[PDB]
Design a protein around this ligand. Sequence first.
Ligand SMILES: *[C@H](C)[C@H]1/C(=C/c2[nH]c(/C=C3N=C(/C=C4\NC(=O)C(CC)=C4C)C(C)=C\3CCC(=O)O)c(CCC(=O)O)c2C)NC(=O)[C@@H]1C
Ligand SMILES: *[C@H](C)[C@H]1/C(=C/c2[nH]c(/C=C3N=C(/C=C4\NC(=O)C(CC)=C4C)C(C)=C\3CCC(=O)O)c(CCC(=O)O)c2C)NC(=O)[C@@H]1C
Ligand SMILES: *[C@H](C)[C@H]1/C(=C/c2[nH]c(/C=C3N=C(/C=C4\NC(=O)C(CC)=C4C)C(C)=C\3CCC(=O)O)c(CCC(=O)O)c2C)NC(=O)[C@@H]1C
Ligand SMILES: *[C@H](C)[C@H]1/C(=C/c2[nH]c(/C=C3N=C(/C=C4\NC(=O)C(CC)=C4C)C(C)=C\3CCC(=O)O)c(CCC(=O)O)c2C)NC(=O)[C@@H]1C
Ligand SMILES: *[C@H](C)[C@H]1/C(=C/c2[nH]c(/C=C3N=C(/C=C4\NC(=O)C(CC)=C4C)C(C)=C\3CCC(=O)O)c(CCC(=O)O)c2C)NC(=O)[C@@H]1C
Ligand SMILES: *[C@H](C)[C@H]1/C(=C/c2[nH]c(/C=C3N=C(/C=C4\NC(=O)C(CC)=C4C)C(C)=C\3CCC(=O)O)c(CCC(=O)O)c2C)NC(=O)[C@@H]1C
Ligand SMILES: *[C@H](C)[C@H]1/C(=C/c2[nH]c(/C=C3N=C(/C=C4\NC(=O)C(CC)=C4C)C(C)=C\3CCC(=O)O)c(CCC(=O)O)c2C)NC(=O)[C@@H]1C
Ligand SMILES: *[C@H](C)[C@H]1/C(=C/c2[nH]c(/C=C3N=C(/C=C4\NC(=O)C(CC)=C4C)C(C)=C\3CCC(=O)O)c(CCC(=O)O)c2C)NC(=O)[C@@H]1C
Ligand SMILES: *[C@H](C)[C@H]1/C(=C/c2[nH]c(/C=C3N=C(/C=C4\NC(=O)C(CC)=C4C)C(C)=C\3CCC(=O)O)c(CCC(=O)O)c2C)NC(=O)[C@@H]1C
Ligand SMILES: *[C@H](C)[C@H]1/C(=C/c2[nH]c(/C=C3N=C(/C=C4\NC(=O)C(CC)=C4C)C(C)=C\3CCC(=O)O)c(CCC(=O)O)c2C)NC(=O)[C@@H]1C
Ligand SMILES: *[C@H](C)[C@H]1/C(=C/c2[nH]c(/C=C3N=C(/C=C4\NC(=O)C(CC)=C4C)C(C)=C\3CCC(=O)O)c(CCC(=O)O)c2C)NC(=O)[C@@H]1C
Lengths: 162, 162, 162, 162, 216, 172, 172, 172, 172
Amino acid sequence: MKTVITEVIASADSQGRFLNNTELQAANGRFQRATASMEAARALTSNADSLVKGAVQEVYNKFPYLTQPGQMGYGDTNQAKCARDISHYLRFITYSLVAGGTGPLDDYIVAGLREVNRTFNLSPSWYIEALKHIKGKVGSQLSGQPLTEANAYIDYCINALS
Amino acid sequence: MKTVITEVIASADSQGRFLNNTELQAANGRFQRATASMEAARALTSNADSLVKGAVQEVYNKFPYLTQPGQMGYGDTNQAKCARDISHYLRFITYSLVAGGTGPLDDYIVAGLREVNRTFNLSPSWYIEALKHIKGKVGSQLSGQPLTEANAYIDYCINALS
Amino acid sequence: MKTVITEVIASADSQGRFLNNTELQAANGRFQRATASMEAARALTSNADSLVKGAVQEVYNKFPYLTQPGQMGYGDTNQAKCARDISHYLRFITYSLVAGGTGPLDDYIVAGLREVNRTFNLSPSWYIEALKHIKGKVGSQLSGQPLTEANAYIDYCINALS
Amino acid sequence: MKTVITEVIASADSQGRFLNNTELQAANGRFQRATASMEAARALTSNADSLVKGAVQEVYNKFPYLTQPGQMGYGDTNQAKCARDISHYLRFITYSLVAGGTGPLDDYIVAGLREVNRTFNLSPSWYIEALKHIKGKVGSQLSGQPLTEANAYIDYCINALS
Amino acid sequence: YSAFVRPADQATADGAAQTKLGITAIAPDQGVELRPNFTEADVITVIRAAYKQLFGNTYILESERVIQAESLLRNGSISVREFIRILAKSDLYKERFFRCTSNNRFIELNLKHLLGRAPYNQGEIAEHLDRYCQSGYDAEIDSYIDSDEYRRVFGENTVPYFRGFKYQVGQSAAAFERMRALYSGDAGSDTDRNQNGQRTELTSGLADPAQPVRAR
Amino acid sequence: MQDAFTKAIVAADLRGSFLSEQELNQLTNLVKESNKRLDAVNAITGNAAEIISDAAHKLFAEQTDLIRPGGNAYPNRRMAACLRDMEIILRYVSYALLAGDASVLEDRCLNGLKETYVALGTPTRSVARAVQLMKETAIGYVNSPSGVTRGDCSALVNEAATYFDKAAASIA
Amino acid sequence: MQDAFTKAIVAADLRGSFLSEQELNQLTNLVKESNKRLDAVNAITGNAAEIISDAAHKLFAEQTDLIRPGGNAYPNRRMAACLRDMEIILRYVSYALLAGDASVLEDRCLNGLKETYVALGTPTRSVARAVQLMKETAIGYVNSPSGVTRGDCSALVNEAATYFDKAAASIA
Amino acid sequence: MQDAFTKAIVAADLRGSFLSEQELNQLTNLVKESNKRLDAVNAITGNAAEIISDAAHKLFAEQTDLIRPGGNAYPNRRMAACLRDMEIILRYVSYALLAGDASVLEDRCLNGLKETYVALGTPTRSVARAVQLMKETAIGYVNSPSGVTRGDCSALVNEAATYFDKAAASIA
Amino acid sequence: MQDAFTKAIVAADLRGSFLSEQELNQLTNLVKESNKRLDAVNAITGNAAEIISDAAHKLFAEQTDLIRPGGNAYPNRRMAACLRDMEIILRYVSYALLAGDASVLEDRCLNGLKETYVALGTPTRSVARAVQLMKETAIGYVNSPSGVTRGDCSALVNEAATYFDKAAASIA
Ligand SMILES: *[C@H](C)[C@H]1/C(=C/c2[nH]c(/C=C3N=C(/C=C4\NC(=O)C(CC)=C4C)C(C)=C\3CCC(=O)O)c(CCC(=O)O)c2C)NC(=O)[C@@H]1C
Ligand SMILES: *[C@H](C)[C@H]1/C(=C/c2[nH]c(/C=C3N=C(/C=C4\NC(=O)C(CC)=C4C)C(C)=C\3CCC(=O)O)c(CCC(=O)O)c2C)NC(=O)[C@@H]1C
Ligand SMILES: *[C@H](C)[C@H]1/C(=C/c2[nH]c(/C=C3N=C(/C=C4\NC(=O)C(CC)=C4C)C(C)=C\3CCC(=O)O)c(CCC(=O)O)c2C)NC(=O)[C@@H]1C
Ligand SMILES: *[C@H](C)[C@H]1/C(=C/c2[nH]c(/C=C3N=C(/C=C4\NC(=O)C(CC)=C4C)C(C)=C\3CCC(=O)O)c(CCC(=O)O)c2C)NC(=O)[C@@H]1C
Ligand SMILES: *[C@H](C)[C@H]1/C(=C/c2[nH]c(/C=C3N=C(/C=C4\NC(=O)C(CC)=C4C)C(C)=C\3CCC(=O)O)c(CCC(=O)O)c2C)NC(=O)[C@@H]1C
Ligand SMILES: *[C@H](C)[C@H]1/C(=C/c2[nH]c(/C=C3N=C(/C=C4\NC(=O)C(CC)=C4C)C(C)=C\3CCC(=O)O)c(CCC(=O)O)c2C)NC(=O)[C@@H]1C
Ligand SMILES: *[C@H](C)[C@H]1/C(=C/c2[nH]c(/C=C3N=C(/C=C4\NC(=O)C(CC)=C4C)C(C)=C\3CCC(=O)O)c(CCC(=O)O)c2C)NC(=O)[C@@H]1C
Ligand SMILES: *[C@H](C)[C@H]1/C(=C/c2[nH]c(/C=C3N=C(/C=C4\NC(=O)C(CC)=C4C)C(C)=C\3CCC(=O)O)c(CCC(=O)O)c2C)NC(=O)[C@@H]1C
Ligand SMILES: *[C@H](C)[C@H]1/C(=C/c2[nH]c(/C=C3N=C(/C=C4\NC(=O)C(CC)=C4C)C(C)=C\3CCC(=O)O)c(CCC(=O)O)c2C)NC(=O)[C@@H]1C
Ligand SMILES: *[C@H](C)[C@H]1/C(=C/c2[nH]c(/C=C3N=C(/C=C4\NC(=O)C(CC)=C4C)C(C)=C\3CCC(=O)O)c(CCC(=O)O)c2C)NC(=O)[C@@H]1C
Ligand SMILES: *[C@H](C)[C@H]1/C(=C/c2[nH]c(/C=C3N=C(/C=C4\NC(=O)C(CC)=C4C)C(C)=C\3CCC(=O)O)c(CCC(=O)O)c2C)NC(=O)[C@@H]1C
């Protein structure tokens, strides 16, 4: 899993050299930032649910036809899934903030994203909206660096999805 | 040349991916620290000379026989060289503080250290003393993080020499 | 282990061919020489001790300060070691004469020489003197080809040490 | 080309080390032997022709049918070739004696022997006889080491042919 | 000045440790490098070596040997790493040393034939397994010689070697143990043709929890 | 590799001297801007996918032929490459931007690029065009972000431009 | 790989839940100690060469045989290896110390180390001994540095120990 | 690798002593025999092809089944192997003979051989047989050469035998 | 590779003839000198380290700039290379000396060397200088040994020179 700390170790390890000043400097960076990161996570964790509802919802407004019978958005099972899924995305995001690296995201969400989505005919687009809507809400509860961090990660997914 | 900034780029580059949050965190670390680093460099740069004199000198006290005729420490040429050399070490150290990485040290000083020393029969020990004596002096002009940084680098050489 | 005989086998083996005339010629060389080699070994083996004493001693004359307290040459343990070590060098040399190859030397003495010496702060220089002094003594007890052989091997180490 | 001298250089070269005593011993062997080798060559060179005639001839006695019309041994062109060829074998052998290695043989005669012979339907057997008959004659003009050398090389071909 | 030396107890010596493992000089390796000016013999020795290292040490018939790849070495215009690419892209290796064994098997055996190391971790074995369907086989083998460490050591103009069975950098555990499994005796060689077919020396079971144990 | 700091060092080395106090003050101030610098980079990386997507659309609206049979962007296979390429260039540019130095970009990326394009028969002109298209979009984001402390980024903006342009030029 | 943070995540994942507030407070405090953590590491790395050098001397004074003809540290070549080994182990330990987790150490360094040693005929016991010798020296530095703000490092010191010990145990 | 000389050295090393004068006299004498030793080797190498050819013929006359469908020497492919193998073994034996030591043979040639043979399904017994067949023929030449100075080679002859036999045994 | 013997062969081959009696007498004589030849080589190899060490000292006393910042021998890394290079050249020279032929030296070592040096910005002049410095020192040993039977080595001495010089020339 890719976090700041793991990477420097990795790089140090590959070369076969002790952790010198260079790397520690880097680590320090991660730790200083954490305070902001951590704050953001506490904020998302708390409002989770509400964000999720809002997102799921949004998607349907954006793509009305989904709710019609014979479609994917139709019938509760699917709605449940849709909810679940977004929860996940969120969950991971929090994780990543705390871990101080994309790692968590990469391994759970991103890797194999495409094929999953292809085989089940999930349109990336949808997820994206979810995220965007979220981003917009988050853009109220947070501010300054905490916010900035939140964004970075949220986006990172947008980019991976698209 | 190995600095924080170069490495993250390298790692990013290898994987073939954009610089994401992970790396930036690291970079930030380097920059925050710099203020202390920079200070240290200004201090060494100023007292350079005096440190050099003191060191060279020390070495001779430590190893009297060097100054005897037929030895290495004997005859001005050699003394001049001895001075020059230590200057170098110092010079680089400053560099490294500023660059925020061991890089400068590695490429100039460390790489090929052994063989140089072997072929000219320079005993690592000597240099070391120089450094140690230095370290001791530096341990007055500086304080707190600035100091800590100075040490790290000075040492790094001790370890490379030995 | 590298001796004449082993090598030709090796080379033959690599190509996947029988030992043909080419190699035998080489082997023959080794055997013809042996008579001289063997003689040399008998001479060193006999005077071993005396050579050792003389060498150890020499080193101290060459580097008086070693015998001062707080140095390496000081206190019996160290002296014992110093003796032991040189004995070894000698021992191996004899071996190599008999084996008709550097092999014995390479594998015991040479391989890893540097790092050992570095980590324990043994100055190659010392050993060298030992050898030189030896060489000088040997240059009396022996003569002609026997001598020549003795030298070759002794030197081979000088070069490896330096 | 494979001779004693070339090989040791090669081996030395590969390892990236100077020619030490080991190799020189080998070389020495080659040189001592040469005196015998050289003698042998002078003997073959002189009687060349006569050896060739005798051989060619032999082959026909051994394999009468070859001289019948519609066969390979039949018609002068073929006989001429047959002569030429054996000359070659001889020529090379001399070379190899002088070079002090199989080298010359390997590169001219041996490498690709099979396929040549296959595509032109030359039966190894024939050549062999030629050689054997030769060997027998050589076993008169020469004696002691000179002889021994001659054999070695002659054989080496027998083995390569078969 | 006692110069007590003494035979000591264990009396293992230099040689005994390796004879115990049975390496018999497989762990020590002398690299072979091609030169722009080279004797044909020197090319031959390279071919000889190349064959062994990438092949099981299995017998190679003259018919088996691919002459077109051998041609071109004398000429130039083929990097030796590229020469080694031609081999394995060869039908010879795919039909035999690839078909019989399981996907995992050839990955380990490639990772052995092309590089001394046995596989440090389950995940990296898995990385090549992702490739099997992800892309064509040729790519995956190409990926090995294109991998960095293949390049880093014996990168160009050098026959690969079983640098395994010595200390290599970043060996995640059981380097020796796995390698001990993967190398039989020097005379002994992986066989395209074998009873019980061909199975992975290394337990699929492990590659994470425990060191492998294999007949030697 | 190289970057702003390392660079200054190297220069100083050849003179054989400690860093001049004046020169330190270049670096000292450079540090101060870091935060700005960083956000700039962050903005690019954050929008990456889009930047490209966008630029492409416009590229192909302009030079219709590229996507027509016989053009260079046809068929799929080729198209893919062309997209990939754009991205790469971008990636590098970013790198540079962080480093505070062209080098990385020149050395890893731009070197030999032109020649490649030539050998393939790819029309260098069009490539260059794309680079610019990208440039403008990118700046767009760098310069108009959300949640960032309001201030002047011009200095950085221009340096960004330059990088894009070195790219455009050496390709073209 | 793994480390303190990642680990806690993973646990949380399997439960399928957002992180407990309690759990955050583990990490929150862990952060606070960082500075201490770092210096600890720095101290080891700074003294590395020495730590080893020292440990060795003591190792060989104790087990004379290792250095005697026929022993395991004899001749030079072997000696070298033995030194190298010690170093490595150390290197790893350090790594762990930074991560705040044994894992890295266990996986790359320890797992199957024993078996190796066995196969070679190297006496596992002696290796273990060396590890400890190292431990003590190392702690020595961690705990007695110069120019550092004075406070309590015990917490870290002990964790360091543990790492050394896992090593000692699994080798032994 | 190893050979007579090297070997004696190694032994001496573990005792921790210079070479015994007695021990030198083993090697001194060994040297004297060289010339004989060499010729022995030369004889084998000179006749190589034939030795094998011969042995094979006899092997197959005896154990008809090997060449019958279902046997181990059938079809061609296999046959070839079997020939190659014999050769190899021989090659090694020769090597040993020169070295004045079994080792080389044991390590490169015999080590693992049995197990291989097992895995293949090759009947070890027959292999062994072949080895002997070879042995006898080989000795034949070693012992009856032409143009060599007449003397006693028995000593060497027997040592040769032993090598063949170690082969036979470890295969079997 | 090539050497004196092989060479003469090759020539003879193209004529299609047995070796000229005249030509044999070149080789016959060459043999006679062997012993001398050998000792020469031995002397170089024996003193190797020194030869270099020496030459270097003198090289750097002369061309002070090489060791100054901005020069080619600075910093350490480069220095090392420069030493290594000298050695290599020497190594080859030796080889040649034994072979009795320039080839090996020319082909493996000298070929392309100039151009390399040029591309790097290494001053070819200085390299050449070093080669000579070496030459003189080397001859020094070849020509003044101890415990060797006294006689005339000139013939060999000059050939040695030539090798050095081919080196000097092709580099320069
Ligand atoms: C919400 C925007 C839309 C929606 C989604 C939906 N998803 C599936 C099926 C799957 N979706 C995922 C996603 C995840 N599962 C995971 O474990 C992870 C990583 C932690 C993710 C992001 C997966 C893997 C599946 C496939 C297997 C499964 O059953 O979950 C469906 C069902 C489609 C089907 O044919 O099974 C749906 C409908 N639901 C909506 O209404 C939106 C359009
Ligand atoms: C000081 C403790 C002793 C001393 C020094 C001394 N040095 C040399 C020779 C060299 N010194 C160096 C070292 C460096 N050169 C570099 O470029 C750098 C890195 C930036 C270093 C550290 C080098 C390369 C040499 C080799 C040749 C040269 O410098 O020209 C000597 C001369 C030794 C000789 O035999 O030439 C000396 C004496 N002087 C003293 O009195 C102390 C013993
Ligand atoms: C003699 C000029 C100096 C001296 C010697 C001395 N040696 C050591 C320690 C070691 N010596 C060696 C050397 C060898 N050991 C071998 O196995 C071989 C090859 C056969 C050699 C040449 C080794 C291995 C060591 C290091 C390990 C050890 O404990 O022996 C010391 C002690 C160093 C220490 O820190 O313990 C000494 C003093 N004594 C003198 O007075 C001279 C400086
Ligand atoms: C003599 C024993 C029999 C014989 C000879 C014969 N040879 C050929 C053809 C070739 N023989 C060789 C031999 C060599 N050519 C070389 O260059 C070398 C190495 C330097 C050797 C040893 C080769 C290469 C050929 C093929 C090329 C050629 O034929 O010119 C023939 C011709 C057969 C044909 O044309 O089909 C013959 C007849 N003939 C006899 O009388 C003996 C049975
Ligand atoms: C001949 C007297 C008998 C015989 C031979 C035979 N061998 C094989 C197969 C193999 N032989 C080896 C052995 C070696 N590996 C080495 O490197 C060396 C020299 C150091 C030897 C001698 C190996 C490894 C194989 C496997 C080859 C492969 O997998 O392709 C066979 C064929 C069996 C098979 O299925 O491969 C045979 C026939 N066996 C007999 O029947 C004779 C009595
Ligand atoms: C897209 C804007 C335009 C375009 C590009 C294009 N490129 C290729 C092929 C290659 N382009 C490169 C790219 C790079 N090589 C490098 O070294 C770097 C930096 C690391 C880059 C940017 C290379 C090497 C190739 C050849 C191999 C490959 O797979 O890319 C093509 C395809 C060439 C072909 O003949 O199929 C294309 C089309 N061409 C356009 O149409 C656009 C205007
Ligand atoms: C410039 C293109 C636009 C802009 C930027 C701007 N940023 C700041 C201040 C900060 N920006 C950051 C961001 C980072 N620092 C990091 O370490 C990382 C990686 C994790 C990032 C992404 C930080 C920490 C600061 C300091 C605190 C803060 O955010 O305010 C400013 C303020 C001035 C300054 O130099 O600090 C500005 C102006 N604002 C614009 O108007 C441009 C569009
Ligand atoms: C030193 C404290 C004791 C000792 C050790 C020793 N080890 C070897 C040889 C090897 N050791 C290893 C071990 C490692 N493999 C790994 O993966 C790691 C890190 C996870 C290690 C540390 C290996 C691979 C070797 C074998 C190859 C090599 O020698 O480089 C030796 C040498 C013995 C030999 O013949 O191999 C020794 C001496 N023995 C002592 O003397 C100490 C008590
Ligand atoms: C523990 C074994 C020892 C110790 C450590 C200690 N350190 C601090 C505080 C700091 N130490 C550092 C060091 C770093 N921070 C970084 O970012 C880096 C990487 C470049 C390093 C090396 C810093 C910056 C601080 C803050 C300022 C300061 O030096 O005090 C403390 C204070 C308490 C705390 O940090 O929570 C302590 C206790 N003190 C001991 O008792 C041992 C000597
Ligand atoms: C032994 C199986 C049979 C035998 C051998 C025998 N050889 C010699 C003497 C010599 N043999 C050689 C041969 C070589 N020496 C070399 O350097 C090489 C490689 C180039 C070879 C092949 C030499 C030079 C001698 C000396 C002169 C000579 O030929 O006599 C003897 C004589 C006794 C001795 O100790 O040398 C013997 C007996 N003779 C037989 O009849 C055995 C069946
Ligand atoms: C020439 C530069 C100087 C010189 C050389 C010289 N050497 C000899 C004679 C011999 N030299 C050797 C040496 C070797 N032969 C070998 O096989 C080996 C490698 C193992 C060596 C090192 C030998 C054996 C001889 C013959 C016996 C002897 O030297 O007593 C001579 C004498 C003439 C001759 O060619 O035999 C000479 C002149 N002597 C000088 O003073 C030159 C400066």
